[PDB]
Amino acid sequence: MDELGIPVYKRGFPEHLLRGYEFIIDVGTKIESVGGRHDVTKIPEMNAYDIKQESIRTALWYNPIRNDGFVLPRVLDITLRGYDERRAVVESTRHKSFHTNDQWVQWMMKDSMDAQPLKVGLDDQSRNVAHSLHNCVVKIDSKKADTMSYHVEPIEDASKGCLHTRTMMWNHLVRIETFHAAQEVAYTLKYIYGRVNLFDFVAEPGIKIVHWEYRLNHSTREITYAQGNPCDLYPEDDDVIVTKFDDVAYGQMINEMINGGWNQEQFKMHKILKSEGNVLTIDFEKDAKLTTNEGVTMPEYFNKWIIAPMFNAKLRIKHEEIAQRQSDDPMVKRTLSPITADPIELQRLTLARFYDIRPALRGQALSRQQAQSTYDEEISKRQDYAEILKRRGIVQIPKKPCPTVTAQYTLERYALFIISILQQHVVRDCDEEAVYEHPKADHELEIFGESIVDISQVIILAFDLIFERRRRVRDVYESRHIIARIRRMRGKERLNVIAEFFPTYGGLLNGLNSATVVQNIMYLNFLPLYFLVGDNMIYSHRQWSIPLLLYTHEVMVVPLEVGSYNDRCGLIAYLEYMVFFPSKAIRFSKLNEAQPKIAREMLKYYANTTVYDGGVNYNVVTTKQLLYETYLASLCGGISDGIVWYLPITHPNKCIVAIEVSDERVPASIRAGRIRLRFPLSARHLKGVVIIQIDEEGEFTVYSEGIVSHRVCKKNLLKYMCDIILLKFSGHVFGNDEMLTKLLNV
Numbered sequence: 001m002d003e004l005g006i007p008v009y010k011r012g013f014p015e016h017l018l019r020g021y022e023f024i025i026d027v028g029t030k031i032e033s034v035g036g037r038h039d040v041t042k043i044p045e046m047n048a049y050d051i052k053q054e055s056i057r058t059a060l061w062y063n064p065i066r067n068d069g070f071v072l073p074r075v076l077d078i079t080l081r082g083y084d085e086r087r088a089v090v091e092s093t094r095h096k097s098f099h100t101n102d103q104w105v106q107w108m109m110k111d112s113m114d115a116q117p118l119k120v121g122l123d124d125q126s127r128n129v130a131h132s133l134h135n136c137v138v139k140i141d142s143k144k145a146d147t148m149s150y151h152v153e154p155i156e157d158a159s160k161g162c163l164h165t166r167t168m169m170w171n172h173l174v175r176i177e178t179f180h181a182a183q184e185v186a187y188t189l190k191y192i193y194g195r196v197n198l199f200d201f202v203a204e205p206g207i208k209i210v211h212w213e214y215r216l217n218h219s220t221r222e223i224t225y226a227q228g229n230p231c232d233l234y235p236e237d238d239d240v241i242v243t244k245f246d247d248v249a250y251g252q253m254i255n256e257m258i259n260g261g262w263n264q265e266q267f268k269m270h271k272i273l274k275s276e277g278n279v280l281t282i283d284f285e286k287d288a289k290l291t292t293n294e295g296v297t298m299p300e301y302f303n304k305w306i307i308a309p310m311f312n313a314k315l316r317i318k319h320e321e322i323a324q325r326q327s328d329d330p331m332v333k334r335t336l337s338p339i340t341a342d343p344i345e346l347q348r349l350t351l352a353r354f355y356d357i358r359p360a361l362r363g364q365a366l367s368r369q370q371a372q373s374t375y376d377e378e379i380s381k382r383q384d385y386a387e388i389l390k391r392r393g394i395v396q397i398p399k400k401p402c403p404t405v406t407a408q409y410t411l412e413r414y415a416l417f418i419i420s421i422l423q424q425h426v427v428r429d430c431d432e433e434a435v436y437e438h439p440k441a442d443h444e445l446e447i448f449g450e451s452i453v454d455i456s457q458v459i460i461l462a463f464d465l466i467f468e469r470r471r472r473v474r475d476v477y478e479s480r481h482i483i484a485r486i487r488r489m490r491g492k493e494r495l496n497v498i499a500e501f502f503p504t505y506g507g508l509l510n511g512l513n514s515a516t517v518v519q520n521i522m523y524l525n526f527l528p529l530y531f532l533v534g535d536n537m538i539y540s541h542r543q544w545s546i547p548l549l550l551y552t553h554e555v556m557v558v559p560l561e562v563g564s565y566n567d568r569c570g571l572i573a574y575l576e577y578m579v580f581f582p583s584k585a586i587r588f589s590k591l592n593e594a595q596p597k598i599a600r601e602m603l604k605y606y607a608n609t610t611v612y613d614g615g616v617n618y619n620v621v622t623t624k625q626l627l628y629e630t631y632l633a634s635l636c637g638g639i640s641d642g643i644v645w646y647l648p649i650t651h652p653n654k655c656i657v658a659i660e661v662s663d664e665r666v667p668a669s670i671r672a673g674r675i676r677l678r679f680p681l682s683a684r685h686l687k688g689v690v691i692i693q694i695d696e697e698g699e700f701t702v703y704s705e706g707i708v709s710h711r712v713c714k715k716n717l718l719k720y721m722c723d724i725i726l727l728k729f730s731g732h733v734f735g736n737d738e739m740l741t742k743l744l745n746v
């Protein structure tokens with residue numbers, strides 16, 4: 001009750017002796033610094049928050065097995081907001097009783113990229129759960145322990161334009177494939193030939209390969225709204241193969257569909273293209289035959305361009321000299337005439353049989369300091385960099401951007417691009433006599449004012465703006481639960497929680513039994529946007545294809561595989577077809593006979609598709625937050641260790657006090673502000689914040705906010721001696737109850 005003290009001792013203070021206290025700082029066993037950073041490399045050795053030592057993209061996919069299980073940093077905030085928001089419901093006697101939304105708190109608990117896996121140094125002669133940390137071992141009495149977690153933070157470095165609260169967002173980018181560097185697929189002799197991935201080809205410049213060139217058939221037509229950027233199937237270019245839709249197969253598909261409903265399993269994009277020579281079937285290891293005579297016969301397209309208008313692609317194979325030799329950091333383009341740098345271009349290369357991507361990071365997972373991958377500075381030279389960064393509130397401009405700068409760039413330009421693409425499928429009411437460059441992003445676009453941080457946010461926004469005309473971005477948790485809640489339902493009820501959040505939109509696909517013109521059917525294409533993307537999901541089975549309408553002159557319903565002929569997920573799978581939309585005349589057409597029934601089938605298919613559902617490895621995928629935290633610390637930084645744990649207070653009001661032990665490097669107050677950040681929606685309960693800051697020399701120094709009040713003083717049991725940080729909470733009883741376990745078990 002009222003004031004705890006926390007003794008902080010260096011060996012050899014016995015601590016047989018200190019067990020009376022509830023929290024202890026042993027300053028003690030330090031980890032030596034390797035000047036001037038203190039070295040993350042010892043982490044797998046100390047205990048720790050396990051991160052095996054490894055080249056960093058194979059840290060991403062890592063498992064982890066040296067922990068004792070996972071704490072979530074926000075579990076306290078999760079259930080404080082859980083408890084704050086209970087429904088009242090009147091009882092049989094007229095008393096209220098308060099029901100937890102205990103299913104939003106389940107969903108909120110899973111679906112949490114925070115989670116970190118720690119190894120504690122738990123001993124069996126005392127009840128104490130030790131956490132090693134670079135300057136001290138902190139030992140919490142187990143009753144207080146459940147909330148404790150690291151609050152590691154890499155040093156913001158102003159020349160790089162750092163903003164490290166965006167770390168999570170970075171990690172989220174990588175998970176949804178928008179931080180990768182690319183490279184076209186390549187072959188060599190190992191039938192003869194065989195694919196060889198270019199990131200690690202270990203070959204000197206001046207040696208030949210065969211490699212797919214792969215450009216957009218043409219990004220950015222100069223289109224006018226009476227036209228549409230319809231994807232005409234008949235380019236008039238000499239001596240290039242074009243891929244054609246096969247009418248007899250496509251007709252059979254549509255009849256199977258109008259009768260038996262849409263078939264995700266058995267419908268296929270490759271199946272409705274004429275074989276000579278369709279992009280989805282052709283292969284190179286299986287097409288350059290041995291043969292018998294006279295030999296070395298390359299497949300009949302081996303220098304020709306192959307325009308593929310449905311995919312807006314234009315890939316051709318070739319012999320090509322490589323450059324730049326091998327190196328460990330994509331993007332260093334691995335050949336003369338390579339494939340594109342800019343990340344929103346890669347979002348457009350639907351066919352992904354033709355290139356490999358790995359996330360653009362470089363080197364050891366635990367390094368105290370290493371040169372950054374060049375990808376950031378390479379995104380930086382992009383035109384439209386300065387202009388899109390201004391929306392981010394970055395007035396100019398890092399010369400060697402930290403990843404989070406280019407994370408911010410990437411996700412903001414991405415959002416602009418997805419909206420400028422999608423705005424075309426709604427009706428527009430403006431002069432069609434105004435040419436404009438079509439799939440250009442807007443920059444001047446008006447949206448405000450919760451800053452973009454998640455594609456789920458961009459999706460909620462695609463509907464909120466295109467349909468609701470609510471030009472406003474929702475909080476990341478509100479949107480992730482919006483999508484989660486749409487997916488959670490099937491059948492008609494899924495259509496009810498759409499049109500609960502987007503009433504005009506669902507209110508206009510609820511209505512499609514009317515649907516006279518093609519414009520009315522045209523709204524179905526937005527549907528894939530729920531099921532197609534998120535940092536933590538994998539497709540139930542990639543190679544299922546979901547229905548879509550591409551707009552050539554006549555509105556064909558293609559199946560697009562999710563995705564994308566390369567087990568990548570997602571929003572590549574889908575986004576690029578959407579860059580085609582009908583000419584205004586095709587956009588009024590007044591349907592025909594089969595179109596209403598195809599649309600009824602499409603919406604009925606999405607109404608209960610579960611294509612997003614295939615089970616993720618939660619253990620692998622959510623756990624990586626501390627990996628990016630310390631890796632990024634190596635890129636700028638270095639790191640600053642620190643655990644925080646929350647001490648519940650129970651009178652007069654029920655309220656949390658964060659207590660925080662940490663490295664001396666970043667100043668206490670800013671660290672306290674960041675502490676308040678782990679309460680995205682419950683900050684109001686966090687009523688005061690102690691921050692003990694142990695020096696590298698073992699020279700600690702407290703700091704505190706409201707409700708708490710520290711005062712340091714020596715304790716001298718005979719020869720043995722050490723400081724006890726007293727912590728008065730004047731006016732607040734806080735002791736004898738299961739407050740913490742009540743607080744969590746909400």
Ligand SMILES: [Zn+2]
Binds near residue numbers: 156161162163402403
């Ligand atoms: Zn940085």
